[PDB]
Every structure is written in C-alpha cells, then in structure tokens.
Amino acid sequence: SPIRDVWSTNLQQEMNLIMSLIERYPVVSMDTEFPGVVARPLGVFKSSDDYHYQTLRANVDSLKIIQIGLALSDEEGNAPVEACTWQFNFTFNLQDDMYAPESIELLTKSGIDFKKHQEVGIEPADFAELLIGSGLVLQEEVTWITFHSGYDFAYLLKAMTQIPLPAEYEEFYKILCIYFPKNYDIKYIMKSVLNNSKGLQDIADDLQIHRIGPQHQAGSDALLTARIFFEIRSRYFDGSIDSRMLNQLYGL
Ligand SMILES: [Mg+2]
Ligand SMILES: [Mn+2]
C-alpha cells in the first residue's frame, strides 16, 4: 500500500519509520482534515489579513483535527519506496465533539470511518510530542510543503505548544518560523505569483497529475501537494524555486 494509515495502535512504529527516513527524504508535504468551519469572527479588524488570522485562530482553537497527511520526498521529488504518504487518523467523537454537519457528511462520503476514529483514533498530544522529537520540525534541513497553510500549521502549533494560539498574527508567524524554519505555501506561489486561482485538484488536473487515493483525505491530498510542487518547480521555475517565496503565507 502506497498510503500507510496510522492509528493509536501503530503510531509509535510509524513515527520511527519516518524518523529513519527524514534525513534521506527531507521534503515533507502535508495536508489536514478538520470538521469544516463552524463560526466567523465578529466585529471589524486591523486589516483583511487580520480578519483571516482571527477566523483561522477561532476555528483551529475549538475544532478537533481529524486527519493529518505527511508525504516524504527527497530534494528532487522521489518518495521513499516504503510509503508514498502517511495518514494519521486522530481521535474524534461524533456526539461529543463540535463540527459542521456538512463537513462530516462530506468526510463520510469521502471514505472516513468515524467509528474507528472514536475507538483507535490518535491523541494529538501524543503525536505532537513524537513530532517534536522526530527531526521533522525545528530543523532547517527539512522543507515543509503545503496548500493554504495557516490552517495546516495552526493545527500543528496547537498540538505542539498545548496552549491557545497567539492573539496577534505577528506572533503566530514568529512561532511558525521556529518549528518550520523552511517552508513553501503552494497557494501563495500559484496565486500570489503565477496568478492562478484554481484549487488543489483543479491544479492537479490541468497538470494531469494522477491522484493516488480518495479526494478529501489527508494522506492522498498531501501526496498530491508534493507532486504539484515538484511539477510546478520544474515547469515554471526551471528546477529552482525562487526563494523569495520561502516562508510566504497566503492571506496573512
Ligand atoms: Mg484537505
Ligand atoms: Mn488543506
């Protein structure tokens, strides 16, 4: 299987395998899945970036993460033969937890098993602790890759710090750059730079990238993200991503 699914029962084993690989495959692609958006930040804000930060901060703080996908690559885009992508399935309770009914239905139709998440779902606290020690974060050897990544990284900071997210955005970014000193936001590149508005799969399609796995699942999406990035890096940047785009976050 190209996607290695991770639950509370094999978390430890799976992280070990990733720690064994991270030095040879130091480009980490990520996607997340949460229970949608359930509320908007009231009032008027310092800017539009500040409206966005508070929308994100409000949502991350209160809504539990459901899946995180991590796809490893080396500096020229090769996946480990061991796994194209990992999919960490976190703990989640349908009657007890908060969420948009629509997101849940979408996820269910997407292949999710909310029964198994309630049972053997992973605790974000445990995963985050392993992540901090993994060599994936806090290391500039490792590049992180994501699509629209305030949310992806907020959910991470959330679990690693174990405290509520920063009040002002400029702090959120200071911390971000601590744990992920070297990262590319694909949305920022496709949009802010190449003036392409299209979303992940649309971009995936115009490039004819074969999707491995179901849509709307973190593992398969993180993989798609990886492949998109490398296709983009060769097609339009001739092999080298302009590093003026390093650490640039779309909409912040
Ligand atoms: Mg997604
Ligand atoms: Mn995403």
Curated annotation (Swiss-Prot):
Residues annotated as signal peptide: none
Family, per entry: Belongs to the CAF1 family.
KW Nuclease (keyword) present: yes
EC number from the UniProt entry: 3.1.13.4
Required cofactor names: Mn(2+); Zn(2+); Mg(2+)
GO BP term, pick one: regulatory ncRNA-mediated gene silencing
GO molecular function, one term: manganese ion binding
Stretches of the chain forming a coiled coil according to its record: none
Positions with a binding annotation for Mg(2+): D31, E33, D152, D221
Keyword Nucleus: yes
Function description: Acts as the catalytic component of the CCR4-NOT core complex, which in the nucleus seems to be a general transcription factor, and in the cytoplasm the major mRNA deadenylase involved in mRNA turnover. In vivo and in vitro, caf1 has 3'-exoribonuclease activity with a preference for poly(A) RNAs.
Cofactor note: Binds 1 Mn(2+) ion per subunit. Binds 1 Zn(2+) ion per subunit. At lower physiological Zn(2+) concentrations, Mg(2+) replaces Zn(2+). The nature of the bound ion affects the speed of the RNA degradation reaction and, to a limited extent, base selectivity.
Protein location: Cytoplasm; Nucleus
Origin organism lineage: Eukaryota, Fungi, Dikarya, Ascomycota, Taphrinomycotina
Parts of the chain that traverse the membrane: none
Catalytic activity as recorded in UniProt: Exonucleolytic cleavage of poly(A) to 5'-AMP
Record organism: Schizosaccharomyces pombe (strain 972 / ATCC 24843) (Fission yeast)
An example Gene Ontology CC term for this record: cytosol
Keyword annotations of the record: Activator, Cytoplasm, Exonuclease, Hydrolase, Magnesium, Manganese, Metal-binding, Nuclease, Nucleus, Phosphoprotein, Repressor, RNA-binding, Transcription, Transcription regulation, Zinc
Chain sites annotated for binding Zn(2+): D31, E33, D221
Protein name: Poly(A) ribonuclease pop2
Broad class of enzyme this protein falls into: hydrolase
Major localisation: cytoplasm
